[PDB]
Amino acid sequence: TNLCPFGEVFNATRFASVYAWNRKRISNCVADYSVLYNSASFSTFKCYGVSPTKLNDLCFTNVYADSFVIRGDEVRQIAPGQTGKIADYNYKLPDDFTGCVIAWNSNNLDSKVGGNYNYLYRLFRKSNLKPFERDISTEIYQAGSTPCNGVEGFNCYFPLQSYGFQPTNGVGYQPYRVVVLSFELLHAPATVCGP
């Protein structure tokens, strides 16, 4: 009866920026998935391939918990086959994704009067992200043809932009904490079952 450490993912003091999204590999424990899907604290809880409805009746080899913060209007980008700044440059789910996306409004925690600038996202990139890729680079983005020399200027932009989370923003602009659960299945052990 080793219980899967979901509290350290969902109840963390600070979440990661989406460009530097956090991954927690969950192993050798018992996950009571139902408690989450039947707790009614989340605004988003959509599963792909698996079914939220009592499929805590399956065994997986490894379960990954990815967590980060974005604005509410961008939660729609955490899904297979989506486009946008988040899906293309920060966090990309595959077309055949098997797992769940969980999100809730965190305006009470991640907003601050005057603005909370702790959370960043990648605004520019030379190409789109492969599924489950992570780019934490800080290279100045070359938009023109003259080299940037590692500083911003004309056609030379710092690639990361900050959300300014203020408590008075609209819901579409308010911060949302997101947890993405991946369910992996290799021809191996199967260590996370969880009745």
Partner: protein, 596 residues
């Protein structure tokens, strides 16, 4: 990467940077406007100065992408809007000179005082002192004293400044490759490179003049009826064929004829619909007023107000020691933050203003998904036209009867219809010759068609000929009477009030047809018509992204300003006016003056 791809990436950075910098400045401005302190005036200035500085720098960077190498029009619109030099095409010295002139003219207007003869300490400002005289007094000499003193002591200070202001504005405009500063102002209507929807800066002059010829008959008969009524009140001061004395028009300039209603009302025994007493009888408060206004927009298919609107707006006077600027305003702060600031009283006037201001909010919400720089009305007259049609519907007896403020035992008789339409015409129609006349004189001054030594001569020539108004005292070229109006001394274009007036009746007519209204246009109420709401939303969500000719066609099916809906709205009054004036002189001689 091509030059267009560079501009797309540059605008990408700008939109994200501007969104937060504009939000901070709007937040600081909001905190001052709802809580007046010295700490707040500085924070408002600091956040505003950063936002202005950010704009100045981004305009310079945008000028490094020549519009000539961009094809995508929505990119060219935003790049051009940000590129505009403004005063920053002049040398720093001429800009600084011009900004000093603008600030002095503004300070003279807002601190200009007039003292009564024989008490040099009993002095009045324009607001509220002189405005109270010009809106309420019936005494010929008191009104004359306020009218002349304002122009003789404050207007004369503005004369040399306004001369220099014209020279520097024209240099600024010609360096931006306009003919003059008036041509620059007409640029707000310019559309290029959209086949079938284009519109030139000079075409605005022709369309304003063409539609104004069609207004002349209704105005002439409104002028003749008003003059006859005033001649009964003031028989020794008013000629039956002459112009109306300028100081007898209900405010400091005769911009609106609203306050002539009491002396001109056709049927002075039928009272106004005044629903304020029923609002107090039912213990309405400000939240009820704004809840009813929200219901109205929801009834035609528009979204309700956001949760932040109810939490963050200021819908009542904070009262107490905490002070606030109480002029009603709709705030689009960005980032999904929409607010109304209003010191609402429980009155029918404030009930209508709330529908007006919430109309602005609906417009703001509808184009929020547009890029930052296209988040505005299709042109300078669209936003205000959208706000006005909301109070048109909300004020009808039909609408006030469905929300339980007007008794079911009140039915419309034609005498109250004429009273209402005459009150409307005093404000709406009365201002159209005033507005056209003022802008025309400014356009001719900027064009160079009026020499300096004939500014006032031509100003009162055009007042007599176009407006039918005559100065009660002769004014030489030491006066600057046009600058005695806020908009002229404070450097605001004025034709927007003309175009907006025509747009609003085009909107109302189109929406009321979509709502299948039967009967005279002025009795229409678009409530419960999702067809009307959809037709309006199709324009609202465009913002500035499409030509205003196309945005207008979305609502009304036509590509241009059209005066026929305005005439249709006032037709019951026009017919009654023409019968009233059967045995009066219609028109005016320009040579009569009260100083003989």
């Amino acid at each position: 990467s091509t030059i267009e791809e560079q501009a797309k990436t540059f605008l990408d950075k700008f939109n994200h940077e501007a969104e937060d910098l504009f939000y901070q400045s709007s937040l600081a401005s909001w905190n001052y406007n709802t809580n007046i302190t010295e700490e707040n005036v500085q924070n408002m200035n600091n956040a505003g100065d950063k936002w202005s500085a950010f704009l100045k720098e981004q305009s310079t960077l945008a000028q490094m992408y020549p519009l000539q190498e961009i094809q995508n029009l929505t990119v060219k619109l935003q790049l051009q809007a940000l590129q505009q030099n403004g005063s920053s095409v002049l040398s720093e010295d001429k800009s600084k000179r011009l900004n000093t002139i603008l600030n002095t003219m503004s300070t003279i207007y807002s601190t200009g005082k007039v003292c009564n003869p024989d008490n040099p300490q009993e002095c009045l400002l324009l607001e509220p002192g002189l405005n109270e005289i010009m809106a309420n007094s019936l005494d010929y000499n008191e009104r004359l004293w306020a009218w002349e003193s304002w122009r003789s002591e404050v207007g004369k200070q503005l004369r040399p400044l306004y001369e220099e202001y014209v020279v520097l504005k024209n240099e600024m405009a010609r360096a931006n490759h306009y003919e003059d500063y008036g041509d620059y102002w007409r640029g707000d209507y310019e559309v290029n490179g959209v086949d079938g929807y284009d519109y030139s800066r000079g075409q605005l002059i022709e369309d304003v003049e063409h539609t104004f010829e069609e207004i002349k008959p209704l105005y002439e008969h409104l002028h003749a009826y008003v003059r006859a009524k005033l001649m009964n009140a003031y028989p020794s001061y008013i000629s039956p064929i002459g112009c109306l004395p300028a100081h007898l028009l209900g405010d400091m300039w005769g911009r609106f004829w609203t306050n002539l209603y009491s002396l001109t009302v056709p049927f002075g025994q039928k009272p106004n619909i005044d629903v304020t007493d029923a609002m107090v009888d039912q213990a309405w408060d400000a939240q009820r007023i704004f809840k009813e206004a929200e219901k109205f927009f929801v009834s035609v298919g528009l979204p309700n107000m956001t949760q932040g609107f109810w939490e963050n707006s200021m819908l009542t006077d904070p009262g107490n020691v905490q002070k606030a600027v109480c002029h009603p305003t709709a705030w689009d702060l960005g980032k999904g933050d929409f607010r109304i600031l209003m010191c609402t009283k429980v009155t029918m006037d404030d009930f209508l203003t709330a529908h007006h201001e919430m109309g602005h909010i609906q417009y703001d919400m509808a184009y929020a998904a547009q890029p930052f720089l296209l988040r505005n009305g299709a042109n300078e007259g669209f936003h205000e036209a959208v706000g006005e049609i909301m109070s048109l519907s909300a004020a009808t007896p039909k609408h006030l009867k469905s929300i339980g403020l007007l008794s079911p035992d009140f039915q419309e008789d034609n005498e109250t219809e004429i009273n209402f339409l005459l009150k409307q015409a005093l404000t709406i129609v009365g201002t159209l010759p005033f507005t056209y006349m003022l802008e025309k004189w400014r356009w001719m001054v900027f064009k160079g068609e009026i020499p300096k030594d004939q500014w006032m001569k031509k100003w009162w020539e055009m007042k007599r000929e176009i407006v039918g108004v005559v100065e009660p005292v002769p004014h030489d070229e030491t006066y600057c009477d046009p600058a005695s109006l806020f908009h002229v001394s404070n450097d605001y274009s004025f034709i927007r009030y003309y175009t907006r007036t025509l747009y609003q009746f085009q909107f109302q007519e189109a929406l009321c047809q979509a709502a299948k209204h039967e009967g005279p246009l002025h009795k229409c109420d678009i409530s419960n018509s999702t067809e009307a709401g959809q037709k309006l939303f199709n324009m609202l969500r465009l913002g500035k992204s499409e030509p205003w000719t196309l945005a207008l066609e979305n609502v009304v099916g036509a590509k241009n300003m059209n005066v026929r809906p305005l005439l249709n709205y006032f037709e019951p009054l026009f017919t009654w006016l023409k019968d009233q004036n059967k045995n009066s002189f219609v028109g005016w001689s320009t040579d009569w003056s009260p100083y003989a």
